[PDB]
Amino acid sequence: GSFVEMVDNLRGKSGQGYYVEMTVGSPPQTLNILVDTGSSNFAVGAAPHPFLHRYYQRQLSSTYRDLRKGVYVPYTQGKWEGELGTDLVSIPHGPNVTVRANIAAITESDKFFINGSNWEGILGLAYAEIARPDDSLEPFFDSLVKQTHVPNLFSLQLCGAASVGGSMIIGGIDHSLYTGSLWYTPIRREWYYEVIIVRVEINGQDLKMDCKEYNYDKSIVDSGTTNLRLPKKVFEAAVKSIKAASSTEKFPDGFWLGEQLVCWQAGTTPWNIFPVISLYLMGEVTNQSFRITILPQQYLRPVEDDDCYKFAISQSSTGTVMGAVIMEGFYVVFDRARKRIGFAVSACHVHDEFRTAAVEGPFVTLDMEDCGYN
Numbered sequence: 001g002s003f004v005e006m007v008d009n010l011r012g013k014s015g016q017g018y019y020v021e022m023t024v025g026s027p028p029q030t031l032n033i034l035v036d037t038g039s040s041n042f043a044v045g046a047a048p049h050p051f052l053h054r055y056y057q058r059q060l061s062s063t064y065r066d067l068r069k070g071v072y073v074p075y076t077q078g079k080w081e082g083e084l085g086t087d088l089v090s091i092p093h094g095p096n097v098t099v100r101a102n103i104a105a106i107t108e109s110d111k112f113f114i115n116g117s118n119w120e121g122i123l124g125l126a127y128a129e130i131a132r133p134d135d136s137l138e139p140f141f142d143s144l145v146k147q148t149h150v151p152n153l154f155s156l157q158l159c160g161a162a163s164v165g166g167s168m169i170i171g172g173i174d175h176s177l178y179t180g181s182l183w184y185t186p187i188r189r190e191w192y193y194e195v196i197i198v199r200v201e202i203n204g205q206d207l208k209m210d211c212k213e214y215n216y217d218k219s220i221v222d223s224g225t226t227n228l229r230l231p232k233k234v235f236e237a238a239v240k241s242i243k244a245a246s247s248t249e250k251f252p253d254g255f256w257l258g259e260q261l262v263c264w265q266a267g268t269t270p271w272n273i274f275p276v277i278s279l280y281l282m283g284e285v286t287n288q289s290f291r292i293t294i295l296p297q298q299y300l301r302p303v304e305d306d307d308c309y310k311f312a313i314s315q316s317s318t319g320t321v322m323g324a325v326i327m328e329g330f331y332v333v334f335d336r337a338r339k340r341i342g343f344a345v346s347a348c349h350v351h352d353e354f355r356t357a358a359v360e361g362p363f364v365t366l367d368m369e370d371c372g373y374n
């Protein structure tokens with residue numbers, strides 16, 4: 001509570017990410033910035049690229065300082081390169097402070113900006129270890145914490161819908177955004193927001209795989225990604241098992257690949273025939289775990305075109321990526337200070353009549369440490 005300045009400060013178009021309003025420079029230039037717990041660079045467009053609504057103009061900033069060094073970041077999805085500097089940054093619908101963060105002024109890019117999107121930059125919320133050019137470049141939230149008395153902690157409530165909304169509470173937790181209790185899983189290493197998944201159930205049936213497979217080569221919480229991404233073998237077992245639960249109908253190969261939609265007459269979507277999915281996460285206490293459960297309403301994204309949906313669980317090059325499909329069911333707390341991530345059922349999650357998202361525990365799981373890849 002007492003974080004209503006910040007409630008509902010996230011916007012976006014579904015499948016195009018969530019962004020938050022920010023100001024940089026003196027005088028303050030407003031930009032919409034993509035919120036990404038999957039990287040650690042703060043970067044903005046700095047030139048009149050045709051896709052951009054606005055861009056960062058350093059000429060205008062009296063507080064701008066050049067850093068004279070270049071920087072290059074290749075994501076899976078895309079790539080940019082720019083010039084480093086520092087400036088005064090603030091989040092209007094956040095806590096009224098201002099910090100001197102590093103900024104990547106994007107001078108060239110490819111497949112990074114979305115033609116049609118309403119954002120112009122990316123805010124890397126993860127740790128310095130994975131910042132570019134190297135961990136010497138202080139990530140934004142590190143700067144925010146060192147320079148103010150704002151608590152080393154933030155939380156995201158992403159609410160799945162063309163338009164999408166959500167909240168980023170900075171420095172706090174807002175208890176009206178979740179129901180039930182928060183359960184914490186350890187942040188395994190401070191680079192990505194890495195975690196250990198110790199077990200997976202589909203409608204309640206263990207997928208029966210060595211838990212190490214769930215996390216090769218790592219599992220992370222990534223707000224800049226849309227899908228629940230599973231490692232290849234795990235992905236196979238999962239889809240196989242979902243087909244079985246939904247055999248009451250059957251669908252084209254391409255649906256399970258996310259390349260072809262499936263539609264029903266509006267309001268007749270056979271929700272009951274799709275299984276709830278569960279990830280057990282390592283808990284705070286030795287041999288203790290807990291479970292998060294998402295409904296089909298989370299992994300079937302609606303798409304315009306009847307009621308049509310895209311299958312939004314997909315295969316992963318890395319380990320497990322808990323992206324938007326996962327986060328839109330839960331209030332996620334990034335407790336950097338206590339080095340742990342918190343999950344609670346979201347106040348804004350989409351649920352049907354008979355079933356609901358869940359965070360439950362505790363469970364007994366031995367050898368949880370063995371689920372990690374080393």
Ligand SMILES: CC(C)(C)c1cccc(CN[C@H]2CS(=O)(=O)C[C@@H](Cc3cc(F)c4c(c3)C3(CCC(F)(F)CC3)CN4)[C@@H]2O)c1
Nearest residue numbers: 015016017038039074075076077078079112130224225226
């Ligand atoms: C930054 C670093 C450490 C070098 C790094 C390299 C590879 C993977 C990762 C893990 N986090 C990644 C996972 S990703 O590449 O799928 C999305 C990426 C952020 C990202 C980068 C883009 F060029 C684009 C998007 C997101 C968009 C917008 C939002 C979306 F979710 F709709 C998706 C599309 C459009 N293009 C995350 O940061 C970090």
